[PDB]
Symmetry: D2
Subunit: 123 residues, 4 copies
């Protein structure tokens, strides 16, 4: 449901995600990362699957953040693929891939993989 | 390099990606998969990092497709993270994560990881 | 150090890992998984990097479990790549890839990715 | 299929893997990488699942290499998870995770993911 996702979220690393989920399955917002070559907010764009889900199943969603804004250019993009679980303590569990632009030779070391969990605070 | 991301791309599996790259890093288009629980085109939205690149680096980009359209709703989303390379033979090399919405019991086995290489050929 | 790794470990899913770390960097043991197509123990084999690590850095290690024993054959193999952190509450943080043997056509859906954290109980 | 895993393999990067497959699922050998902070051969140990396969499935296998030998100690370990396919042109298709030992601060960026395809060519 767009509503429950829409809000301010923070993860275990201390980063901020402000997102608005549109009725058509769209997600737009700003991301603030507590770590890496990142300063201030960055635009985020993604999609979520408005599931009929009568199973107590999480909603599958994903978003990209290219790390370039008017103050910094990290030359990298992170995609998060995860599941949103609501209820009283709503969480978004994810796994992410962070690709940095590289030369052909160094492409084998371009992607980092990891996992983040977001806890919601405000709508 | 430059506007070269915009176009129609195909991966090893036969899927098609039609993207438009906006001047401030936005990516919009449609995706049609050749494999999996999917049918027709799907809306995709992403971002690419416009940058200086004296060393011939690729352009970092990424996009998401929630597999729900007017025909199917696979209850999943794939994100592709990768980089575009130009030249006579442009290509987008990516690694993707596909997450399906599971119940708590099955969360351990919710995410598939893989890799696709797209060319305009 | 071989010693601290050697012992009984359990993860958030409730699986057992009994391992003995050899001085040469070898790891052998039995794994008992609380989930998936698995029954009773399975042989595990891996390696760990006997780091001089004066930084409070984790020890990098990895191991494979092919899921075939005398009672079941799951036709799959899981590799865990992680870091061992000791101290009073020693943990092994990992990320894993689970590949199932597939036909050529279905190879794009052969690998699962996830992450497990093990808490130690006994040497 | 059968003992065909045993041999000398090479991946796209030019690395070499020499493995021996034991009858009860063990894998032993050496690995020499062509890229990264590595020098010479390294001990590898793994497992492969010996099975029935009426549908022409690959053989699931996996192995670990801790990048420490008498020459270097990169303080990391790579695990390859994948499957072997036989036929006139045998290949081992894998996805790998490389974890480096970080301090707590850097744990988020400790693991590289990638993919290699090995052939006896
Ligand atoms: N909140 C998070 N921060 C790190 C992880 C994945 S994205 C990452 C920060 C990256 C900042 C930009 C960069 O260093 O390239 N999640
Ligand atoms: N073009 C590609 N198709 C598969 C991979 C990445 S996503 C995938 C298709 C998944 C379809 C929907 C599903 O079955 O969940 N590349
Ligand atoms: N302790 C764990 N159990 C699951 C994860 C990764 S391995 C997995 C169990 C797999 C059992 C065999 C199978 O289902 O193929 N960790
Ligand atoms: N043959 C391959 N070499 C690279 C990939 C997987 S592991 C890697 C080399 C890493 C060397 C040690 C290091 O730099 O950490 N495939």
């Amino acid at each position: 449901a767009e509503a429950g996702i829409t809000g301010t979220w923070y993860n275990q690393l201390g980063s901020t995600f402000i997102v608005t989920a549109g009725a058509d399955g769209a997600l737009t917002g700003t991301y603030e990362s507590a770590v890496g070559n990142a300063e201030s907010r960055y635009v985020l764009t993604g999609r979520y699957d408005s599931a009929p889900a009568t199973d107590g199943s999480g909603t599958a969603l994903g978003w990209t953040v290219a790390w370039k804004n008017n103050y910094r250019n990290a030359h990298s993009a992170t995609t998060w693929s995860g599941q949103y679980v609501g209820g009283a303590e709503a969480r978004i569990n994810t796994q992410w891939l962070l690709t940095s632009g590289t030369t052909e030779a160094n492409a084998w070391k371009s992607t980092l993989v990891g996992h983040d969990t977001f806890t919601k605070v405000k709508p």
